[PDB]
Amino acid sequence: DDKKSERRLAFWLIAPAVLLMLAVTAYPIGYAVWLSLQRYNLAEPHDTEFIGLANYVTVLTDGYWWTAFAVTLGITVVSVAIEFALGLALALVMHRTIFGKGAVRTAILIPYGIVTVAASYSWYYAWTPGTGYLANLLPEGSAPLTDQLPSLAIVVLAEVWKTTPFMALLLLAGLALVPQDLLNAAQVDGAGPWKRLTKVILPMIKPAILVALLFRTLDAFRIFDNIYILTGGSNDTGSVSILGYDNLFKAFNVGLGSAISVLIFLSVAIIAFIYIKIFGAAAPG
Amino acid sequence: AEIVLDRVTKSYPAAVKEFSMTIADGEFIILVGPSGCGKSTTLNMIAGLEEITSGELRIGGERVNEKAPKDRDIAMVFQSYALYPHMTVRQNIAFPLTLAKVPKAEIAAKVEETAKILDLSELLDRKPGQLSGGQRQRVAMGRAIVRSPKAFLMDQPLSNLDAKLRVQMRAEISRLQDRLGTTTVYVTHDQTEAMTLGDRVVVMLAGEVQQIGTPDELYSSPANLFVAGFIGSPAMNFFPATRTDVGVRLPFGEVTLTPHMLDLLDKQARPENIIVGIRPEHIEDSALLDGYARIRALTFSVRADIVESLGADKYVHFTTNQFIARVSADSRVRTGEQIELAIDTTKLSIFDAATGLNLTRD
Amino acid sequence: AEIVLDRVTKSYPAAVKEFSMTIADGEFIILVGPSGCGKSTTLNMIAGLEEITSGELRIGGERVNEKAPKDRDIAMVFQSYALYPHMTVRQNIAFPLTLAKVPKAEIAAKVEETAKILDLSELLDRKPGQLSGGQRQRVAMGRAIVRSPKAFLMDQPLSNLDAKLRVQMRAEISRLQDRLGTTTVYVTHDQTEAMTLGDRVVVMLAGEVQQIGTPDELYSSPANLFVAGFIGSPAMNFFPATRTDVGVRLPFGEVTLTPHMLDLLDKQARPENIIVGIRPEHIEDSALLDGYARIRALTFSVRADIVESLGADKYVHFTTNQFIARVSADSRVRTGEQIELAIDTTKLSIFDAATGLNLTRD
Amino acid sequence: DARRATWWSVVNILVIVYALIPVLWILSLSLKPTSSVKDGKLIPTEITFANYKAIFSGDAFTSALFNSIGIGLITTIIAVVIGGMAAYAVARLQFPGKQLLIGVALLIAMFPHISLVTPIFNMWRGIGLFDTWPGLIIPYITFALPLAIYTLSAFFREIPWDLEKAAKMDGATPAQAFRKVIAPLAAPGIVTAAILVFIFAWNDLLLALSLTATQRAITAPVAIANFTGSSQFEEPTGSIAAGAMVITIPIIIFVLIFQRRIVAGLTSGAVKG
Amino acid sequence: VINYYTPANEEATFKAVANRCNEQLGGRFQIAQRNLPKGADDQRLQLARRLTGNDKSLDVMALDVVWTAEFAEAGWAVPLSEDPAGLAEADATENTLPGPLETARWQDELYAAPITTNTQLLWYRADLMPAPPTTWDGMLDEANRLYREGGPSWIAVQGKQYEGMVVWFNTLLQSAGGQVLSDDGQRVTLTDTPEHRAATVKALRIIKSVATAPGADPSITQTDENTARLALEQGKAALEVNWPYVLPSLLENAVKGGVSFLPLDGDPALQGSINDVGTFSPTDEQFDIAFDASKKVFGFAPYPGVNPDEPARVTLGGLNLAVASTSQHKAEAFEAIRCLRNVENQRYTSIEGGLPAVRTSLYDDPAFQKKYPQYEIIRQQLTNAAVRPATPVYQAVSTRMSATLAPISDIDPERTADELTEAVQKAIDGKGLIP
């Protein structure tokens, strides 16, 4: 038979993956939701009982969270949108090369292995009036870190430069699959160097961007490092992950940190749903 | 335009040799070569692909080489099929035209007429992958029929179709080109398509060309004893011979005829070893007319046992080794050495091994 | 062994609808038919792939209709080539040998003898991305020839190869199967290779079979009015008719008066829309003595003006529609008022419409 | 052909400058004495190497670099190997790739790690090996798996189907099609999920910051944060942004090894008739 | 054995002290320092998650002074009056500077014993200023007068939106009476009575006109204490208030060219050295000549007040020790903690340590003044020392009292008092979401 002889193999094939993924993550998720079901404070343990959705209704009825949300969203939808448009060109230069035999192909990948703290301090020192290789290039007494909009500009640049080797690698690996005869016939059928793209080479890798457009807009949504190490909350610029860090770790307000974690789990799951539904052809289908 | 391929050559870590020749506008040309004989590589080269190594090619009076394939207005149907899997067949046919003059009041009729021509008008919904071979081939051909370029370059365009579809495509592939549109370079080793279509055929082998005549000047007067034994799939069988001008030789026989063709063979110092080159289509069974009204037709065939049927007319495995002769359908023979034949000794291809230029016609 | 297909229906609307036949050991079954009628699907449903909807396959004393294709021991060559684009041709042919029994002293010589057979010895260590089309075809055939398997399945195994090499390859395939090979199904369209190999052919259109007769009782006496217009490549049955048992006319005159089989023809007693269906390989010029060493075989005196001169056996197109007629080379013809066409009235096989069988041979 | 060799030599430096000048500024910070760290001047004057001999002080950084160079080369291996099984079973198989396994492996990675840390901490407290590799490896693998699942389930189903068919015909048990047929064609699809897992489990500091106690499994990206130069409230720029230039060596000599298997167009097995 | 935990920032000194009390003292029971991270809040989170699990370890531990007892309000760190009839409350406060005995008591008893203290004090460039200001309203006036020069008018403070902002604002608050919350941990006494409100608005008007000063420019809103220690060292600062580390910092830094415009090229005695990462211990003579060369351009004075010579009650810091309640045995911890803060330990911890130690009469001997020549002032900054606000929860109230003060520029003194008070109230009652 084949129906039985494929599922009997597939179950024992995916056994270890989902087994390990449920052995050390099911109980933690359950506990993280339990802590949301009821008020809880680590400063006064066992001094609390069930309260319901009070944490949700108080986080949704403030102004300190919509501000940390309209910033993380306004940063994600402008960081990934420029990251894709730059990673396309970077992967093309990384793939159609004649000298890139590890010359550019890895010098475009070392700026992703630099640790996030040691790479955020670099930008924090880079932009300080008086101290910094480029901060002096600005006019006298500029300090683009004290005001809001230049701070957002520098915090999105320190993300573009950091994560460009993450979507300048998938759009290359999933691009070395495009057969040569297809691009060849596109070339001979009256198509230039751009009309080739978006017509014959792009719709092929459509399942290879769904991995670089779905595993970035999660991490670039919970931006915590490059915004905390770099002006961590000046003039209402803190992201939502910094708001889930402050109210949980440095305040011991577990009953609310769990709610603010679940409230972004949901809001990012809606993005994952929209992305899986908008592309059709995807991982399972 | 007049594509003048002056001394073209490719190399490899050797694939074509000096291809010095020309292709005027309007006329066809049909390459043919046994297997891997610089044939699809010649089309890839004359297109924008496969940059040349010798250093000359002139589409028209221009000097078009090392240029972009897009600026040469050449269509193509590869041996393979591009057949963009994500598009449907409507878009696969409309692709090279929609990157041209856009108006949608044109494609709607164009990709319908050029799909009714190839008998596809009912199959304008599926996408490649859901199509069989005889349909992917037709779509690939349509993607270059629909272009109306200044040169058609079809590379084995109809390989796997049926018989009547093939005889209709061979009609509507020249009933289309006859209006105007190309100095087309057809490629096929079919031995009927290179005879019914091309205005000037081209036989080649391992790069070097052999004969560039017309589809009859090769079947009648073939040069270099390879296009001689190549075209006409029941290949002309080759008997040995001696010099002996008047009566040359046979494997079992010496008396021959036709002095009306030795007036130029008079001046020859060719080595006495001679290949006689009798085509099988010229042989008949002596039990029909004894050759002609003249009874004498050299009744010589004796040993034939492998009589393959083939329907319309059968083939005797003639042996005096491993020769073939063809006899008519009603020939009353079934594995029996009663088939004393009659060859026609007024037309045959005398040859020698060294230079084989014994064409000696016209 | 004994592959007994019984009503193997497949569709996804459609595909092959009703396929009921048997294949004993030894004999070929050469499937033929027009493009998009279902042959590849048949080979797949035989090999297990593309699971059948409402059929009951059988092989030997069991019902292997849902077993894994890996558990059938069936070689195959696809329409496409499915060539491993990284394994050099050596390992690419040796691959099936490196799956069950791997004595390298045997594998190093089996693949060498095989590559010697198919004329691949030179380009033997190379990757199938730098090979030609014909060489890819020959390698895809080599990967299936050296197995000594339980059965064969081939799907146009020689599509793009010169006729010269093609005939040698066909003779070699016949020899190999003569050694031993069971149920060598062979999908092919070249009519010259469906009458010399296949000991039994199956003409099919849109899934349904038409005839499962020997390739002699198929060309001599066709059935269902389609295997007459499909095999015998330049076939022609455009002639109408009007029965008058003694006097029956034609678009040209009195032709059919053959009492030696007219008894069954009148026993038919069917509508008067009958069709005579005269082959092209029997219409001839006015050279041979007509009838059968006689006269009054109805020299047509046709007025057409289309001649095709492929080789030394020309084809005249004659309408006074679109009829065709083979003609010997010696008849000097052109595009004017010309030759009186004589037809031998002994091989007619008159057809009839609205039922379209009129087998007239039983 | 200098035409396509000058454009491609200028657009080969206008990238290796853009993506390098910050990894030159980090070096300039790393190679300056503790008096001129804050005068700009990207090209450092009065260069010294006190910072490297500072970080390498006995048994401080070596036991935290080994505990990472020998845990990354295990998490990568064990997250690609068993993380490729489920991928091959969701791509080239029928039933298991339901909307359940995928809907779970999609929510696993995306859940914020912040709220998830303390349950894992108090779990590993009295369940087993709290402050060593197996206690640190398992969460790394469990949070890297969805990446090595969506990066392989999208490059394991772009292999031409006729290749799988030809693998079936010859009699190749599924343990051999995955070894000699479908693996080497997806070589540019595996060395792109064996690099991302490495870079994820090599420079993260949210788990190993609380789930590690002593020199036994104290990874480099967390023994590089808690440095003390001379005073409590200060940033030892000679030991932070100057140990990165040492932790970046393996992530250089690993990409330089695994960038070979990314070979250009590799498959010629298409319709071709 | 007792395994006291200390921050990784000052850990080698505590290792040497642990040695000198475990192996040098009689063989009673050993001790170690399994340190904890230096995030300064990561440490609190780690200790909290360890004590919550009730893991029977972590006998005694080092906690910052701001976690007075609110760390141990639920019962985390055991009090001293529950000693095994020992000398806990009889030795931890037998005689210790009146300041650091307040930042360990919770309400009416001590829950810890302080080991390290720290007090801010002005550091002014003694070159071009013979009149160190002693009033903030005159402290910025001096810089206003000094605006003639381009950069010496840069008042260098620690006002970034972090703990620095509150630890610099609380000094000014308490320097004119009033407490943030109260004399206890229930109410908010910032603006209740007009007596209290007459001071907050002047504190806000002095922390506004120094950031909007005629010479002060941007980069003052996002300046932590490191910019405040480096502006004076570069050469573009005349007044800057920082902890007492800046004198060793400058005297070991300005040797290497990073000078405050005083030459200090480096005498060929220490210049004749290629000394490793630490540039200390030049047999005290190079240190002597270096300090004597830095004598004329590096002056300090008691913290500049706001009131008429009522000195500004600084906000102290440091590090205290406390026995945890997560140990079934504690007598050994109570015994060892008083051997971990004794004469020799608390002498070394400042003689060749970083943190200014604390003892009854240590600051008044020739055995101490050889390293801290600001001792005559640091022993007075520790008697009338205004501790950071006593609270049952601190980490919450500070990141709101500084969030209200996040944009220092345009704070508009007379307005934001009510907003800051209601913010502190929402922090102290338990309602709201921390920014």
Ligand SMILES: Nc1ncnc2c1ncn2[C@@H]1O[C@H](COP(=O)(O)OP(=O)(O)OP(=O)(O)O)[C@@H](O)[C@H]1O
């Ligand atoms: N990529 C390659 N690397 C090396 N040699 C090659 C490559 N491609 C083709 N060749 C050489 O050129 C030949 C192919 O020439 P060409 O393209 O004319 O063949 P073809 O027309 O496809 O062959 P056929 O019609 O006989 O199947 C090969 O047999 C080989 O000798």
Ligand SMILES: Nc1ncnc2c1ncn2[C@@H]1O[C@H](COP(=O)(O)OP(=O)(O)OP(=O)(O)O)[C@@H](O)[C@H]1O
């Ligand atoms: N994947 C598919 N999905 C739907 N319909 C399909 C699919 N593949 C084939 N078909 C249908 O089957 C038809 C062709 O049938 P099949 O593939 O059996 O023909 P074939 O014998 O291989 O063709 P040919 O004789 O031209 O080589 C197509 O016209 C189409 O309608």
Ligand SMILES: OC[C@H]1O[C@H](O[C@H]2O[C@H](CO)[C@@H](O)[C@H](O)[C@H]2O)[C@H](O)[C@@H](O)[C@@H]1O
């Ligand atoms: O590698 C640096 C970039 O990736 C970071 O990802 C880290 O933080 C994420 C949540 O914020 C985590 O999901 C992830 O595991 C971490 O590696 C970060 O998202 C980016 O800001 C960095 O530019």
Ligand SMILES: [Mg+2]
């Ligand atoms: Mg070819």
Ligand SMILES: [Mg+2]
């Ligand atoms: Mg087919």
